[PDB]
Structure formats: C-alpha cells, structure tokens
C-alpha cells in the first residue's frame, strides 16, 4: 500500500495567517489523485480539494493545493476562526486508498504558566475501599507538559492517566488532569504523595505536596 | 442535498457480530454513487474498510473474510440505504464508523480513479464499542479545596455523564476532563471549578452529576 | 462490453437536455401555433403577455425516430444490467457509436412507444423518499393503447389490470412490503398533467386516465368490460410543455386521426402522506418531458476524449 | 426563515425564489410534507393538499425564477410553514391568519364598551393596537376592547396584528350613540 507522512503533527497559528501543511508519498503519483480533509473535534471530516488542486463546490477559496515529485501541500490562507481543527491528506491512486497521521492547527498565544493543584482522596473514597491522588494544571499555554508522581519519593509508573481538555474558545490555553490510583492499603502506608510539573513558562519544575493526613 | 443518516451507538461483546446503517438521503441510487466504509480509533487517524461501487462490494485485505457490505434502492418510506457487517467483534474493533458516499456519474470528474476514490459525502458516524462491562452507575466524590475544587465521577459504564455545577449557575472558570478508560474497562472523569478564595466559606458548590444509562442521578455539595 | 468502472446519473444527464431542447426545435418547424403567448415580467410584478401569430398549416406530425452519435473528441457510454438504478457506478458499461433509435414522443402520464424493460418492471427514481421527484416506471411488457379523435382510446383491461399489479407489487419492493398500495387519478394541475395527453396527429390528445389509475390493492373493476375507454378529448388552446405560456392550434380537419401506441412505461408520483400507515397512494405525473428523454437514456452518457 | 401574516378570507402569496432567472423544478408541501403545488417544467402540479383548490403560483413569474404559492379565501387553519423545495433549497416560509371579528353590531349606544375578538392560529401570540377615528391607541393581546365607547369613536378603527415584525391592518367601523341630542 502507499504510505502518506505528513508533516508537522502540529502547528500553532493566528488570524489572518498564511499556514502550509505537507504529505510525502511513499511512492510517485502521476495522476495527482489526493485528496484533503478537515475534521473539527467531535465532528465527521469534511472533503475540501481533490485531485491535488481542485476545490469542492462550497469550500472557501483560502484553500488551495500543490505538487511537486512526492510531496503535496496544503495551504490556507487568511486562517479563519473555524478553520482551526485537524487535517487530512489521503492518495487514491492506488488501492486501497490511504490517509496520513493527521496535522492539528491550534491557536498561537503567549507563554502561560499552568496553576498547580493537588488533591487528596476523600475520606468518603478511602471508605469505599480505594484512593485516588489528582493534580490539576489549570491554564496554560503551550499544552506541552510533563508531570510526574512521586510517593515516598518513589518514581511512580503505570498507575497514572492523564486526561486534557480542548483548547478554550476565549482564552486559547488548555487544562489538564493527572490520577494517580492505587488501593486504599498502600496509600495508608506511605506519608508524603508529590506531583512534578515541567513547562515551559515554568523558570523550575514545580513540586506541589502533601503528607497524609494534613 | 445529500445528508447521510447512520444508524446509534452500539455496545458489543466480543465475539459477537454487529450490523450498522446508512441512510442516503438525496441519493437517487446506488447505480450512481458509491458507498466507501471508513473507521477512526481513538485518536487515531482514518483507516478504509469496503466499497460497494456498481452494485459490487469488496473489502480491503485487514477485513476480508470478516466484513459484509450491502446496498438497496428504495423509495418513498425510506431514501436508499447501505450497511456493513462486522463479524467476530474483539476490542481493535471499537471505533467510530463513517459511512461515505461518491457519485460516479461522470467518469472524467476526478473524484474517482478506477474504483479507489476521494469521499465528498460522510455521515455522522456511529461509535461501536466492544467490551464485556455491563452497565453501572458512578460513584462521585469531593475535591475538596484564588482557590480550585471540584468532584471526581468514578467507574461508570457506559458513556456519557453529565456534570453541571450550581444546577447550571456556575458556569465560568469550569473544567470538566474527558472520561478516561481504566484498566477496570470502566470510566472515570473529573470536573473541576476555579474559584476566589475568600468565597470559600460564604459560597455553596455543588456538582449535578447525571448518569442516564444507569438512571442514577447525584447532587454532591463540595465542602472545605 | 469495456472493461472499465464509471458513474452514470440519468437524473444529471447532460444528453437528456441536449434532446430536450432539440426536440423542442423539432417542434418548432413542425408544429407551429397560431398564436403562442407567453410571459414577459421585468421582475415588477405586473407581466405583459408576448403574442405571436405565424401560420398554422395542418400537419400530420409523425415522429421519426432520433440517433445520437458522438461526434468526434466524444465518445458515448452504455451501461448494462437488466436493473439499472441509472443512478451510480455500471460495471457492465460499454462504449457505442449512436444510442438506439429513440422516438421522441412527448406526452404526459404514459411513456408511448419508449423501450421496455428487459428484464422485469424496473422503477427509476432521483430519490423515492422524496414525495416530489417523479417516479419513472418502466415495462417489461408494452400496454397496446389506440386513441382516436372520434373522441377515446382503448386499453386492455386485461393488460392494464396486470400491469398495475406488477408496478404495485415493485412499488411496496421499494417503499415496504408490508404497505399497501393505491393508485390515484391526478391530484390536480393543467389539463396536461391531469389526463393522459399527447399528441397524435398533430392534434393534442387529452384522455382521462381515471380508469387507469384508480386500482385499490384490493378490488378490481371488469364487471361488463373488455377493454378499457379512455374518452378522450382534442383540444386547439394549450398550455406548452417547451415552455410557459398557450398556444392555439387550428381545429382537426382530416377525414381521421388514429394512433396505435405501446405503453412502455409511466411516470407516478406518490403522495407524502407525511410517514402514515402504509397506504402509499401513487397518482399520474410527469409533464416534463425530460423525465421522458431521461427514460430513454437513463443508460447512457456521452464523454470527452482521453 | 421568511412569515407573512393573512386575513382570515384574503388571499397571501407565499414567496420563493430561484437563484438565477431560469424557470426550474419547484415544489409546495407544508410541514407534514404534504405535496401542496409544484411544477412539472411548464405545468403546474397540484397536490393532495386540502388547500388545493385554493392554492395556485404564478407561471408568469417562474421565468424570472419566482415560484409564489398564492393561498386564497385564506383560513386561520391555513396557517402553518410551507417550505418551498427548490434546487435542493427550503425556503421554509410561516404563514399566519388572523381574524378580527367585532362582537355586537357595528352599532353600540353610547358609553357601552366594545369587545374584540382575534380569532388566531395555535401557538400564536399577537399583539392587537386599533385607532380609533380620534386617536385611541388602546391594546389588546388577543382580545381588545373599549371600556367606555365614547361617541367620538363611532367611526373607522384601525387594528393592527404584530407579530414577528410583520403586522395586518383590520380596518372595523364602529357607531355610537345617545338617548338622542
Ligand atoms: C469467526 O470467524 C472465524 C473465521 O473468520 C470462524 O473460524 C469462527 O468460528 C468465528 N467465531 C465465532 C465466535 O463465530
Ligand atoms: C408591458 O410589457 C412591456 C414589455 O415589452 C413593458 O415595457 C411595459 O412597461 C408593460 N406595460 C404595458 C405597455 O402594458
Ligand atoms: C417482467 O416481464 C415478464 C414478461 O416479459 C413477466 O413475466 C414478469 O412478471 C415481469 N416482471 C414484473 C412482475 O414486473
Ligand atoms: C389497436 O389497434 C391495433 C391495430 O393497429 C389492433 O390490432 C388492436 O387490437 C387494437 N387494440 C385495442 C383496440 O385494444
Ligand atoms: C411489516 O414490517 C416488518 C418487516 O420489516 C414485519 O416483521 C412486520 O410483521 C410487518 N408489520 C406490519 C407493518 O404489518
Ligand atoms: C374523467 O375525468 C374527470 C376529471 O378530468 C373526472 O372528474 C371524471 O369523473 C372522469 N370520468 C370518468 C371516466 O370516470
Ligand atoms: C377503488 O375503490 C373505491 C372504493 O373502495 C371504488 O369506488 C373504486 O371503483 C375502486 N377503483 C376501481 C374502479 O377499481
Ligand atoms: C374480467 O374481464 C376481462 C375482460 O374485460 C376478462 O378477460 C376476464 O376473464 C374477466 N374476469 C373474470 C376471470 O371473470
Ligand atoms: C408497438 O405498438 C404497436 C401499435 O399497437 C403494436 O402493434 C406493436 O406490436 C408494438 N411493438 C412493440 C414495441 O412491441
Ligand atoms: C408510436 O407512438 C405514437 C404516439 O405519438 C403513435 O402515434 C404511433 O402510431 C406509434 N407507432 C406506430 C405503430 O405507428
Ligand atoms: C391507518 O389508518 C388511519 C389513517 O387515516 C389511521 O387513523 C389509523 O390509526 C391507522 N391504522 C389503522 C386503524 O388502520
Ligand atoms: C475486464 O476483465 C479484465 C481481466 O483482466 C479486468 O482487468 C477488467 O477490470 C474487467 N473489466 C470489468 C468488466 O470490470
Ligand atoms: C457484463 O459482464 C459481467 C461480468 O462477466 C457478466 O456477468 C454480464 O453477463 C455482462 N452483461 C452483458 C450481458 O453484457
């Protein structure tokens, strides 16, 4: 089968930006038989040009496409409000027809460092047999972030999921969720449970902790 | 205007079989365009299943042999309509399925190279997920506490729950995370709210957390 | 038969306008009115009617029957298969020189002198969900049909009896077998939507096709007759199928007018009904003739060069 | 989503229009999709409608790609929303029939209050505002009147029915009186 990389994964944008996303394929395509997509979170995709040039009756004319040898290029021009979401290339030269991994196009905004908070488990939890420790990072722009979980000052892996929101329609930033889970025994045995978080606004990792039962 | 109307959300087991729908509103026939299935994972990019194109259906080599797709003509009580069946269902199958569709009409249009196509119509999809868990309302507990707090909704199933804070008052500084998948195969979420300190012992928060599958509703005041 | 994959649309046709309009110039240079009125609106409401007064030579226009042949740079396309939605990708597809000879017969309700089916009674629709589009049915077995300006054509009951069922029965093969299905005279209209017309002889036909369309899934209608008497009725003061507006044409003169066609096919249209109990009710239609070319080349679309 | 206000017994004409000025396929049907009045290219269709020997569109106009669907001897049931299926369009348009009906004789003594009934479709909230021959702007939702008809009122009243930024006239006379001089 062809094999489409496309490239960036992501991109950061404003208003009025002239913005260019791009797909090799694996192998020549003579009859420029590619196609783009766009899908917005929680929605079906949407067909915007084919044959590597040709716009879609009701697509705007911002979007436009190019060759040249294996790669093909999407470009919009004078980025609007909804066209920020997720990107598709796809060829149907040759069967089956394949998709590239996606290119996501966020808002551009300064530099915000998250807020940082920790919260124990409920004594109504830790009643019904289970513990679960949660760090919030509220607030921040760019979403790239790292925490980690320490108990005991022990590095903790494979007992934590993260959870992160879209980016916010008013203030461009995003907010994320860490859980940390384990049973109700351990949590009662270990005393300090600490969250790292690393950002780039954040001149030092920050520790946010507690000991139990503070 | 060409609307694809795809058939509900659906719950299966492994190993069981599954059959979904499409409704082709403002497609005269199936002799005239052609249906692709297509499937997304979970954040994951988009993947071809089948076609059926001239009134002939193929499916493409990861599906062959375990994926039927067929197509009718009708009229009047119902637009024409195509569906896809899923064989021997295991947990690589959950995915949202997009039911597409292409006139091939015009064979100089460029839509299409001899059977391997673009897809200029998509339907809404519809999410398949495949899992032994049975039904189970949530458990909610407080977060308790510029100040943040709010409630952790904990093992349900299935999606979704619904949380608003205040009977919907409290709308601004509100955070409510995507469920996440635990290793249980139930789900959990968190809502959290960002608020002044100094309300704190003034001002009453409760989370509205609503569960409709289970019929269980919960009201829980989040206290310092 | 070429080994290829393409889309056909008959409801997106090009060839059907591009007849459409030419027998509309065949009409022109054949059948021309004493007047003809038309509007003539700048948009501000008030319309003044455009005359036009030519002569009105009594001819006995008789259709002869139309090729199309691609010219050059242009290659024409058939599709095969014995059920043809006429609306998607043909497999059996295959290039041809000139499409069959086609006899123009422009009329309403009944599709005269067409071609039949070749497998069973297929039924053609740009969508049949949508109680607007007109439904094109086609026969695998022609209706004999003689109309005569005495005043009434005749039909076999027998025939016509049968053909109702075997639409019926593919109209519920489309709609829901478990729903009835009725047959209705025109809901209302010009005169040419309403009856059966046509024109034979140069004289314009308007039969009443009450008889015909007035079948219930249930009782039946030959107590004392063998064949079926649609009365008929030649009118000079029509209204124009090529486009908005009357015309008047002199009165029938010679000694008689006879027309002996097949009924290859009609045109239904179902009512909504807005989602009732079954109880389809399928009335005459048609009155753009288009539908009727369409009828015709539902299996064919020309194409450029490669 | 276009509304046109009628007067029960008069006779509206539901707009719609093509894009280009080309007489093309158009099709009537209200709400319950009933088929009301189409076009078969250069004839008109009409369908099982009740309002079909009301209804009727202007040939005349199709050309300039205008596809009305006069409603005449308007009813108060006549009202609805009559989309207007037209080259893959809907032009939904509202349709809304009211009817002003004085009570007692146009003829009132004097001082007597005069009572106005709005007869009006379901779901329809308008608001009245005759004038009297003076200049009395009293109001009425759905039914007016006059608390004391005074003798300078006896005349032509001019109603008028909002809703949705539309309005209808229902000019009504009225005639006061006395014990005599
Ligand atoms: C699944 O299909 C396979 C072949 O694809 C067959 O061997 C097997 O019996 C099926 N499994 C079930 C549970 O039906
Ligand atoms: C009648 O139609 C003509 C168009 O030829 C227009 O110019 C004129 O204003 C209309 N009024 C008359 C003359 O009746
Ligand atoms: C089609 O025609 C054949 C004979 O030509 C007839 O036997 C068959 O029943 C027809 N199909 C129907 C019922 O539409
Ligand atoms: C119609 O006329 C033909 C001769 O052209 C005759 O064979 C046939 O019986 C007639 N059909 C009727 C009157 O049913
Ligand atoms: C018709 O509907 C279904 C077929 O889809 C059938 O099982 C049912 O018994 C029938 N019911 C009616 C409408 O009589
Ligand atoms: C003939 O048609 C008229 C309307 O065109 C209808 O009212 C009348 O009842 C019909 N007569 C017959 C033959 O039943
Ligand atoms: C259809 O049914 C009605 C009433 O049941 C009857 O009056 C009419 O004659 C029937 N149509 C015919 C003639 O088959
Ligand atoms: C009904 O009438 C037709 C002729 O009009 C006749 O051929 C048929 O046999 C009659 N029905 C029966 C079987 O009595
Ligand atoms: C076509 O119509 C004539 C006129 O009645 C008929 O005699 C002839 O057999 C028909 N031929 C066809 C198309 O079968
Ligand atoms: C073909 O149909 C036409 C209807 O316009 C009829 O006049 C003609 O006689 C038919 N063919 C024959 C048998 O002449
Ligand atoms: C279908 O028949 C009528 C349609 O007018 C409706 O009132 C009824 O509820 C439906 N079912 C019956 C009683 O046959
Ligand atoms: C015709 O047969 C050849 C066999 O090599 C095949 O390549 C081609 O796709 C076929 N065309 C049709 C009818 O689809
Ligand atoms: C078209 O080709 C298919 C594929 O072999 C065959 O089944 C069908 O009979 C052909 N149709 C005709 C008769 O042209």
């Known amino acids: 089968d062809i094999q489409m990389t496309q490239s960036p994964s992501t991109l950061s944008a404003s208003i009025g930006d002239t913005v260019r996303i791009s797909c090799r394929a694996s192998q020549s395509i003579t009859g420029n038989w590619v196609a783009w997509y766009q899908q917005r979170p929680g929605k079906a995709p949407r067909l915007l040009i084919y044959?590597?040039?040709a716009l879609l009756g009701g697509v705007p004319s911002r979007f436009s496409g190019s060759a040249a040898g294996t790669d093909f290029t999407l470009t919009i021009g004078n980025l609007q409000a909804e066209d920020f979401g997720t990107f598709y290339c796809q060829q149907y030269d040759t069967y089956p027809g394949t998709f590239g991994q996606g290119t996501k196009v966020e808002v551009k905004r300064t530099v915000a460092a998250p807020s940082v908070f920790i919260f124990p488990p409920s004594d109504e939890q830790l009643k019904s047999g289970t513990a679960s420790v949660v760090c919030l990072l509220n607030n921040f722009y760019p979403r790239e972030a790292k925490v980690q979980w320490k108990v005991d000052n022990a590095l903790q892996s494979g007992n934590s999921q993260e959870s992160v929101t879209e980016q916010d329609s008013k203030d461009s930033t995003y907010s994320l969720s860490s859980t940390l889970t384990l049973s109700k025994a351990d949590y009662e045995k270990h005393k300090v449970y600490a969250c790292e978080v690393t950002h780039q606004g954040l001149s030092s990792p920050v520790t946010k902790s507690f000991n139990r039962g503070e | 205007q060409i609307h694809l109307v795809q058939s509900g959300t659906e719950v299966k087991k492994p190993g069981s079989s599954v059959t979904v729908s499409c409704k082709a509103y403002?497609?005269?026939?199936?002799?005239?365009?052609?249906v692709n299935w297509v499937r997304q994972a979970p954040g994951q990019s988009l993947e071809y299943i089948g076609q059926?194109?001239?009134?002939?259906?193929?499916?493409?080599?990861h599906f062959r042999g375990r994926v039927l797709i067929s197509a009718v003509d009708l009229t009047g009580s119902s637009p024409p309509i195509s569906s896809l069946e899923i064989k021997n269902l295991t947990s690589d199958d959950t995915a949202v399925y997009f039911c597409?569709?292409?006139?091939?009409?015009?064979?100089?249009?460029?839509?299409?190279?001899?059977?391997?196509?673009?897809?200029?119509?998509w339907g809404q999809g519809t999410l398949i997920s495949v899992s032994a868990a049975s039904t189970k309302g949530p458990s909610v507990f407080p977060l308790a506490p510029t100040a943040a707090l709010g409630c952790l909704v904990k093992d349900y199933f299935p999606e979704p729950v619904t949380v608003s804070w205040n009977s919907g008052a409290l709308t601004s500084g509100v955070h409510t995370f995507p469920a996440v998948l635990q290793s249980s195969g139930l789900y959990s979420l968190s809502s959290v709210v960002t608020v002044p300190s100094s309300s704190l012992g003034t001002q009453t928060y409760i989370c509205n957390v609503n569960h409709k599958p289970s019929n269980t509703k919960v009201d829980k005041r989040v206290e310092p | 038969l070429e080994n290829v994959t393409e889309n056909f649309n008959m409801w997106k046709n090009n060839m059907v306008e591009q007849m459409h309009e030419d027998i509309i110039s065949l009409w022109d240079q054949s059948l021309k009115p004493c007047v003809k009125l038309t509007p003539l609106c700048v948009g501000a409401g008030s319309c003044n009617t455009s005359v036009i007064t030519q002569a009105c030579p009594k001819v006995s226009f008789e259709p002869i029957p139309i090729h199309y042949c691609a010219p050059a740079g242009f290659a024409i396309l058939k599709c095969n298969d014995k059920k043809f939605n006429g609306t998607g990708p043909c497999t059996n597809v295959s290039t041809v020189q000139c499409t069959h000879g086609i006899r123009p017969v422009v009329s309403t309700q009944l599709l005269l002198n067409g071609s039949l089916a070749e497998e069973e009674i297929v039924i053609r629709s740009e969508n049949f969900t949508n109680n607007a589009k007109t439904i094109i049915v086609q026969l695998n077995e022609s209706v004999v049909i003689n109309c005569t300006g005495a005043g009434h054509c005749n039909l076999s009951k027998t025939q016509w009896e049968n053909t109702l069922e075997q639409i019926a029965i593919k109209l519920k093969e489309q709609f829901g077998n478990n729903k009835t299905i009725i047959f209705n005279p025109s809901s209302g209209g010009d005169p040419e939507i309403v009856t059966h017309s046509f024109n034979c002889g140069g004289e314009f036909f308007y039969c009443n096709s009450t008889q015909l369309f007035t079948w219930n899934d249930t009782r039946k209608l030959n107590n004392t007759g063998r064949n079926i008497t649609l009365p008929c009725r030649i009118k000079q003061i029509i209204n124009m199928w090529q486009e908005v507006g009357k015309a008047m044409y002199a009165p029938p003169i010679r000694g008689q007018i006879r027309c002996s066609s097949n009924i290859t096919g009609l045109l239904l249209t179902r009512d909504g009904g807005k989602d009732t109990n079954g109880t389809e009710i399928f009335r005459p239609g048609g009155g753009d003739m288009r539908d009727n070319w369409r009828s015709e080349l539902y299996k064919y679309k020309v194409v450029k060069i490669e | 989503k276009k509304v046109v206000l009628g007067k029960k017994g008069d006779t509206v004409e539901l707009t719609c229009t093509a894009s280009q000025k080309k007489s093309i396929q158009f099709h009537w049907k209200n709400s319950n999709q009933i088929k009301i009045l189409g076009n078969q290219g250069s004839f008109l269709t009409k369908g099982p409608s009740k309002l079909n020997d009301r209804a009727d569109s202007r040939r005349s106009l199709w050309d300039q790609g205008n596809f009305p669907l006069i409603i005449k001897n308007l009813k108060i049931e006549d009202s609805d929303t009559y989309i207007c299926e037209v080259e893959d369009q809907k032009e939904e348009v509202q349709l809304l029939v009211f009817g002003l009906t004085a009570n007692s004789d146009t003829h009132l003594l004097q001082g007597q209050s005069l009572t106005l009934t709005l007869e009006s479709p379901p779901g329809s909230s308008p608001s009245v505002q005759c004038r009297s021959p003076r200049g009395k702007n009293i109001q009425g939702g759905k039914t007016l009147s006059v608390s004391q008809l005074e003798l300078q009122d006896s005349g032509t009243w001019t109603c008028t029915v909002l809703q949705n930024q539309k309005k209808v006239e229902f000019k009504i006379d009225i005639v006061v009186l006395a014990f005599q001089k």
């Open positions: 059926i194109w001239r009134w002939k259906s193929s499916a493409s080599h």
């Open positions: 044959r590597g040039a």
């Open positions: 597409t569709t292409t006139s091939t009409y015009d064979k100089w249009s460029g839509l299409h190279h001899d059977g391997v196509m673009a897809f200029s119509s």
């Open positions: 403002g497609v005269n026939t199936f002799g005239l365009y052609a």
